[PDB]
Design a protein around this motif. Sequence first.
Motif, PDB file in Angstrom:
ATOM      1  N   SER A   1      95.161 -47.295  44.284  1.00 13.28           N
ATOM      2  CA  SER A   1      96.618 -47.212  44.629  1.00 13.28           C
ATOM      3  C   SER A   1      96.733 -47.585  46.098  1.00 13.28           C
ATOM      4  CB  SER A   1      97.242 -45.821  44.304  1.00 13.28           C
ATOM      5  OG  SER A   1      97.095 -44.865  45.351  1.00 13.28           O
ATOM      6  N   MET A   2      97.943 -47.439  46.689  1.00 13.71           N
ATOM      7  CA  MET A   2      98.223 -47.760  48.083  1.00 13.71           C
ATOM      8  C   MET A   2      97.340 -47.046  49.058  1.00 13.71           C
ATOM      9  SD  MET A   2     101.967 -47.916  50.298  1.00 13.71           S
ATOM     10  CE  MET A   2     102.886 -47.333  48.891  1.00 13.71           C
ATOM     11  N   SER A   3      96.580 -47.823  49.869  1.00 21.14           N
ATOM     12  CA  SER A   3      95.609 -47.311  50.899  1.00 21.14           C
ATOM     13  C   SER A   3      94.393 -46.510  50.319  1.00 21.14           C
ATOM     14  CB  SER A   3      96.311 -46.521  51.990  1.00 21.14           C
ATOM     15  OG  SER A   3      97.396 -47.282  52.499  1.00 21.14           O
ATOM     16  N   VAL A   4      94.060 -46.823  49.079  1.00 20.00           N
ATOM     17  CA  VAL A   4      92.982 -46.153  48.356  1.00 20.00           C
ATOM     18  C   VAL A   4      92.292 -47.187  47.525  1.00 20.00           C
ATOM     19  CG1 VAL A   4      92.332 -44.371  46.628  1.00 20.00           C
ATOM     20  CG2 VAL A   4      94.238 -43.954  48.287  1.00 20.00           C
ATOM     21  N   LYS A   5      91.138 -47.682  48.024  1.00 23.44           N
ATOM     22  CA  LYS A   5      90.343 -48.690  47.298  1.00 23.44           C
ATOM     23  C   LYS A   5      88.957 -48.258  46.907  1.00 23.44           C
ATOM     24  CE  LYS A   5      93.675 -51.384  46.817  1.00 23.44           C
ATOM     25  NZ  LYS A   5      94.409 -50.641  47.880  1.00 23.44           N
ATOM     26  N   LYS A   6      88.522 -48.653  45.718  1.00 26.28           N
ATOM     27  CA  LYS A   6      87.092 -48.549  45.383  1.00 26.28           C
ATOM     28  C   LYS A   6      86.306 -49.405  46.357  1.00 26.28           C
ATOM     29  CE  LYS A   6      87.072 -48.712  40.304  1.00 26.28           C
ATOM     30  NZ  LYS A   6      88.507 -49.126  40.350  1.00 26.28           N
ATOM     31  N   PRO A   7      85.013 -49.109  46.540  1.00 19.07           N
ATOM     32  CA  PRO A   7      84.166 -49.948  47.375  1.00 19.07           C
ATOM     33  C   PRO A   7      84.133 -51.457  46.967  1.00 19.07           C
ATOM     34  CG  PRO A   7      83.038 -47.890  46.854  1.00 19.07           C
ATOM     35  CD  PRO A   7      84.291 -47.916  46.043  1.00 19.07           C
ATOM     36  N   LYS A   8      84.080 -52.318  47.998  1.00 21.06           N
ATOM     37  CA  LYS A   8      84.198 -53.790  47.847  1.00 21.06           C
ATOM     38  C   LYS A   8      82.881 -54.437  47.319  1.00 21.06           C
ATOM     39  N   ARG A   9      82.787 -54.664  46.000  1.00 22.28           N
ATOM     40  CA  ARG A   9      81.778 -55.597  45.399  1.00 22.28           C
ATOM     41  C   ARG A   9      81.779 -57.012  46.056  1.00 22.28           C
ATOM     42  NH1 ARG A   9      81.882 -60.288  42.014  1.00 22.28           N
ATOM     43  NH2 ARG A   9      79.693 -60.555  41.410  1.00 22.28           N
ATOM     44  N   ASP A  10      80.604 -57.472  46.462  1.00 21.07           N
ATOM     45  CA  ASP A  10      80.459 -58.747  47.229  1.00 21.07           C
ATOM     46  C   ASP A  10      80.621 -59.966  46.265  1.00 21.07           C
ATOM     47  OD1 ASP A  10      79.793 -60.748  49.152  1.00 21.07           O
ATOM     48  OD2 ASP A  10      77.652 -60.249  48.988  1.00 21.07           O
ATOM     49  N   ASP A  11      81.713 -60.702  46.388  1.00 21.73           N
ATOM     50  CA  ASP A  11      81.962 -61.876  45.508  1.00 21.73           C
ATOM     51  C   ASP A  11      81.736 -63.245  46.218  1.00 21.73           C
ATOM     52  OD1 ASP A  11      83.988 -61.974  47.298  1.00 21.73           O
ATOM     53  OD2 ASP A  11      85.568 -61.996  45.817  1.00 21.73           O
ATOM     54  N   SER A  12      81.084 -63.230  47.384  1.00 18.44           N
ATOM     55  CA  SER A  12      81.036 -64.441  48.264  1.00 18.44           C
ATOM     56  C   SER A  12      80.109 -65.563  47.735  1.00 18.44           C
ATOM     57  CB  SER A  12      80.547 -64.048  49.698  1.00 18.44           C
ATOM     58  OG  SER A  12      79.238 -63.413  49.640  1.00 18.44           O
ATOM     59  N   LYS A  13      79.106 -65.162  46.937  1.00 24.07           N
ATOM     60  CA  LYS A  13      78.190 -66.040  46.182  1.00 24.07           C
ATOM     61  C   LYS A  13      78.576 -66.488  44.723  1.00 24.07           C
ATOM     62  N   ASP A  14      79.735 -66.082  44.279  1.00 26.24           N
ATOM     63  CA  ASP A  14      80.084 -66.194  42.829  1.00 26.24           C
ATOM     64  C   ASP A  14      80.272 -67.677  42.456  1.00 26.24           C
ATOM     65  OD1 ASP A  14      80.129 -63.354  42.517  1.00 26.24           O
ATOM     66  OD2 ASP A  14      82.248 -63.230  42.129  1.00 26.24           O
ATOM     67  N   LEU A  15      80.968 -68.423  43.335  1.00 26.05           N
ATOM     68  CA  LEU A  15      81.222 -69.858  43.156  1.00 26.05           C
ATOM     69  C   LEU A  15      79.938 -70.637  42.948  1.00 26.05           C
ATOM     70  CD1 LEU A  15      83.316 -72.269  42.851  1.00 26.05           C
ATOM     71  CD2 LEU A  15      83.522 -72.333  45.361  1.00 26.05           C
ATOM     72  N   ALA A  16      78.965 -70.421  43.817  1.00 22.52           N
ATOM     73  CA  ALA A  16      77.679 -71.025  43.689  1.00 22.52           C
ATOM     74  C   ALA A  16      76.882 -70.586  42.490  1.00 22.52           C
ATOM     75  CB  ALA A  16      76.829 -70.753  44.956  1.00 22.52           C
TER      76      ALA A  16
END
Length: 115
Positions: A1-16
């Motif tokens: 919800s607003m100002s409440v996020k689960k931890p950020k899974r790294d998607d920076s390699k997904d394209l490759a």
Amino acid sequence: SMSVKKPKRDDSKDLALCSMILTEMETHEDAWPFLLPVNLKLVPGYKKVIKKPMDFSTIREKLSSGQYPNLETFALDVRLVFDNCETFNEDDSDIGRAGHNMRKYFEKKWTDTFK
């Protein structure tokens, strides 16, 4: 919800990584029914029956031009290719069997690469 996020899974390699998986699908020996679009002028029935045609070359152009918002949209197009194949071809055909094999091959690579 607003100002409440689960931890950020790294998607920076997904394209490759999707690109590599696609490269291995393209070079498999049972890939031949799936490399180019089905020719809709020469295959009676296909245009009317298959509402959303998909193939590896079309997936490859979408990928290279930033048309996948995320890795799930990419997997959906891959699965569409085999769902279309099942809709139009009998299981006991060469193309029918190629499709079952390629889908098995894809789903393994997908699990191993990401899950």
